[model samples]
Target: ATKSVLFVCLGNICRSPIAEAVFRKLVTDQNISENWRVDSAATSGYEIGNPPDYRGQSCMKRHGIPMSHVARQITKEDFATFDYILCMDESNLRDLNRKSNQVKTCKAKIELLGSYDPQKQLIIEDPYYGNDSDFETVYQQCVRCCRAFLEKAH
Candidate 1:
């Protein structure tokens, strides 16, 4: 059966989209893209309908990872559809947990994506409102965590 993951963050324009793109690249490179459904969403509606932050776009481009996604809030349907809903940080986890409680049929296992990081760095912090360097840090962290997560998925 095909597995699916929905990467999530507060705004969806920074961390989560980058994580989604990075994971997509990892699976695609491994020739397993067809077996996974990868996507991302926001915990809030603040940036809804917006594209990923430009800093994140530049960071992904620098690393040759393609990223293109509009900010979208997490939905009840998403809770039912995705198998794993991996999020960035503690705040995201709390928000998702609360939201999931309101969704009785939510079958997706909500978790912190950073928990899969072999480096033991438990938080992929939001890079919004920071400089380009912050985005680069987020990119590096996502690469590491996504690689580990993919390994466990297999």
Candidate 2:
């Protein structure tokens, strides 16, 4: 069975999507796409069905990461489907736990994406409320962390 991963953030339109794009690119570049199934979601339904945030899209486009998928809220089913539910920030991590009813399925699979980064416990910050540079920062951070994760996982 393919290992599945779900990246989460406050809104799927920004951090999560960017992470997904970056990670997906990494997997493709490494030719390990066949062994992984990657996806992304939001902690809240605020941007459900919306495309990646405009700033996020622009930032990702600058880095050559595709941001075409629509936003979606995390669901209980996701807990079962994904081997890992990695959040971009603390708030999103808490929201995901709450949305999953604090159940084992949710709690067990949940983790901060940055925890896997080699930088030692550096959590990813949300760029939603910040300037465009923040989006680029997140993309860079995710790329490094996601690459590290794939390396370690294998």
Candidate 3:
């Protein structure tokens, strides 16, 4: 069986990309990469042509996780394609839901990524306004949530 997931946030260069990378690493490590399709997208198109934020890249590098994805806005087709559409915060969830509403038929289950955090820290706030340590926190949250998500996906 195969499933697809999309991670979404305001810009796609910060929170959501980290979650995508973390989830990819989790699946790869578990030898189950073949059963999933994974990606990250923005709720807005502001960073549509950019790579992940540099701080996020550095944080991933520090943790030995490779972060290499170009930013893109969530397309209507995404709502029809992905089995899960996970977001970072309330704004992201509402924005995605609004987009889903515009689609003729949406198949994805939109949810908050942090809702899967076992620690119960239910929001992955934007680290773009903060420093390196903030990105570290994002990385940590992604690892926690992604692992839990994969377990349930199984």
Evaluate all candidate structures by whole-model CA lDDT and list the values in order. 0.91, 0.83, 0.92
For residue 130, model 3's alpha carbon misses the true position, in angstroms, by 0.3
Model 2's C-alpha root-mean-square deviation from the true structure amounts to 2.1
Please provide, for model 2 over 1-154, each residue's C-alpha lDDT reduced to its tens digit, 9 standing for 90 to 100: 7888899988788789999988889988888888999999988878999998899889987877777888998877888778888888788878877877755555237888888877764688878789998887888889778988887752
Instruction: Per model, state how many residue pairs clash.
Output: 0, 0, 0
Clashing pairs in 2: none
Off by over 4 Å in 2: 102-108
Error of 3 at 57 (Å): 0.4
On TM-score, the leading prediction is 3
* TM-score per candidate, chains pooled: 0.96, 0.90, 0.97
Model 2: lowest-lDDT 10 consecutive positions: 99-108
Candidate 1 structure quality by residue, lDDT tens digits, 34-99? 999999999999999999988889989988888999899999899999999999899899999999
lDDT of 1 at 86: 94
Cα lDDT of model 3 by residue, 39-96, tens digit: 9999897998999999899999988999899999989999999999999999999899
- Stretches of candidate 1 above 4 Å error? none
